[PDB]
Amino acid sequence: KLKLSDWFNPFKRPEVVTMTKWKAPVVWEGTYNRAVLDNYYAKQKITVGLTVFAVGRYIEHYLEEFLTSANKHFMVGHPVIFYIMVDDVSRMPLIELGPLRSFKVFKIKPEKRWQDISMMRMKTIGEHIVAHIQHEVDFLFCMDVDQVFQDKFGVETLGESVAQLQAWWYKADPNDFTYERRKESAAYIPFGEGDFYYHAAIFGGTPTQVLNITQECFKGILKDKKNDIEAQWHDQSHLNKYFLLNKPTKILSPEYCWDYHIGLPADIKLVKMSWQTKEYNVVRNNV
Ligand SMILES: O=c1ccn([C@@H]2O[C@H](COP(=O)(O)OP(=O)(O)O)[C@@H](O)[C@H]2O)c(=O)[nH]1
Ligand SMILES: OC[C@H]1O[C@@H](O[C@H]2[C@H](O)[C@@H](O)[C@H](O)O[C@@H]2CO)[C@H](O)[C@@H](O)[C@H]1O
Ligand SMILES: [Mn+2]
């Protein structure tokens, strides 16, 4: 029975948003007591899962770097299982894993459009959660492969449902957010509504919550297809619609998924993960 005050101190970061109107903490460097959390979770003997997809040239361009960095920085001190989804297992980079890390790898069907490869992840993750992840871990994170861990990404990020603030918009107002604005889409968020602009590159929670996130998001994806419309920012638009309707119990600051192209302002004290430079001309095969 862990209590927020037991590990979260918002006063440590007075210059940023540390609490939502629905009482959810926004985890910033300096606000968390990882030692207290590590002991707490270690006593419960938790295991944390991490899913990552790599289809096409994303495999050669990002998978090794992602996995090598995850091995070194993700939930260190706790049992972790990496779930790798690739369309070609023969191109799977097999790196050496460290203490408390293991993995499995699954061959998936490569969708023709990169937009569907990104969106289909929602369906696939749900299938795997029901098939086995729900029986293997206490918490699960789903991440994009085009990024790299830079420092400790630990238990301070765990929660029922966890959302990530997108680096470029954490200081902007909702009406400036690139939410889906067409009412015909299931991801529609009207102007005048919205809390934050979440990044689909990182989200997680308990297997139960993530199953609901991926389900619902995929239902919206399929609905739009039936109405001959596709969200401008695909699964990210749908994920934002979901988190608006079902508020996350925990949010991570941009320090947990930073884009160095922005530079490094005062608010970003310690980067835990950074974006890989975009290389669409090579890794994507369609507009
Ligand atoms: O052809 C593709 C398109 C997408 N993805 C996966 O889906 C995520 C979403 O895509 P991307 O990173 O290209 O989205 P962006 O962050 O640039 O919007 C990627 O990180 C990959 O894990 C993939 O493996 N192959
Ligand atoms: O808007 C969703 C979309 O943002 C891309 O990042 C943009 C950012 O939104 C824009 O404000 C800035 O000027 O340029 C960035 C491109 O580097 C993300 O790359 C994309 O994945 C989505 O998250
Ligand atoms: Mn990405």
Side-chain angles (χ1 to χ4, degrees), residues 115-261:
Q115 293 93 327
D116 285 319
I117 294 176
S118 183
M119 297 193 289
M120 269 298 277
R121 293 186 290 169
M122 294 298 186
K123 178 181 187 178
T124 303
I125 290 163
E127 303 180 323
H128 283 272
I129 276 45
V130 175
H132 65 90
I133 302 179
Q134 72 167 304
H135 303 301
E136 308 166 332
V137 306
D138 298 288
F139 297 96
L140 171 76
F141 266 105
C142 164
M143 299 187 193
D144 272 11
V145 71
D146 63 326
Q147 61 192 336
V148 303
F149 289 86
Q150 295 296 350
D151 215 308
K152 299 300 162 285
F153 194 111
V155 295
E156 72 280 3
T157 65
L158 301 179
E160 284 286 307
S161 55
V162 188
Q164 172 68 58
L165 291 180
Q166 210 259 34
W168 292 81
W169 306 89
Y170 81 97
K171 296 184 298 181
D173 295 306
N175 288 345
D176 284 303
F177 292 166
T178 58
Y179 288 151
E180 172 53 59
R181 304 300 188 174
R182 291 169 295 173
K183 62 184 177 185
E184 294 68 39
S185 168
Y188 177 60
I189 296 179
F191 288 97
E193 292 188 10
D195 306 306
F196 303 92
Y197 190 66
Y198 306 111
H199 198 181
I202 297 182
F203 67 88
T206 62
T208 293
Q209 290 309 306
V210 176
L211 177 60
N212 196 61
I213 292 172
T214 57
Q215 285 181 170
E216 293 313 305
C217 270
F218 197 61
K219 282 166 57 177
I221 294 287
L222 294 186
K223 175 170 171 293
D224 280 7
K225 291 180 174 300
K226 296 302 179 179
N227 287 310
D228 188 51
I229 185 174
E230 177 173 282
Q232 186 183 192
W233 290 107
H234 325 90
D235 42 298
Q236 190 168 85
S237 295
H238 289 277
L239 179 65
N240 268 284
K241 177 58 170 291
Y242 178 90
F243 278 145
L244 172 58
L245 299 170
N246 307 285
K247 317 295 190 189
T249 60
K250 175 173 292 183
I251 296 170
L252 306 185
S253 81
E255 295 163 317
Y256 286 85
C257 74
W258 187 249
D259 181 3
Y260 280 120
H261 182 60

Side-chain angles (χ1 to χ4, degrees), residues 255-285:
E255 295 163 317
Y256 286 85
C257 74
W258 187 249
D259 181 3
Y260 280 120
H261 182 60
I262 296 173
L264 191 64
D267 284 340
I268 312 302
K269 305 298 186 185
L270 179 60
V271 175
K272 297 87 177 63
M273 173 97 84
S274 63
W275 294 25
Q276 286 273 200
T277 303
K278 306 301 182 171
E279 296 173 289
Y280 299 157
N281 173 64
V282 177
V283 302
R284 291 180 175 178
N285 299 304

Side-chain angles (χ1 to χ4, degrees), residues 35-72:
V36 164
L37 293 178
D38 274 328
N39 178 63
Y40 173 77
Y41 287 114
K43 291 174 62 180
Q44 299 191 302
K45 296 181 64 178
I46 66 168
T47 295
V48 186
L50 174 56
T51 62
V52 66
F53 290 69
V55 181
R57 304 308 170 181
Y58 276 68
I59 295 177
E60 295 95 320
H61 272 258
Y62 314 117
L63 194 51
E64 175 277 306
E65 276 179 86
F66 178 85
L67 294 175
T68 297
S69 66
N71 178 58
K72 179 183 185 182

Side-chain angles (χ1 to χ4, degrees), residues 13-25:
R13 293 298 298 279
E15 253 65 299
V16 295
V17 178
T18 51
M19 290 290 307
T20 69
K21 69 183 188 303
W22 60 91
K23 302 283 193 171

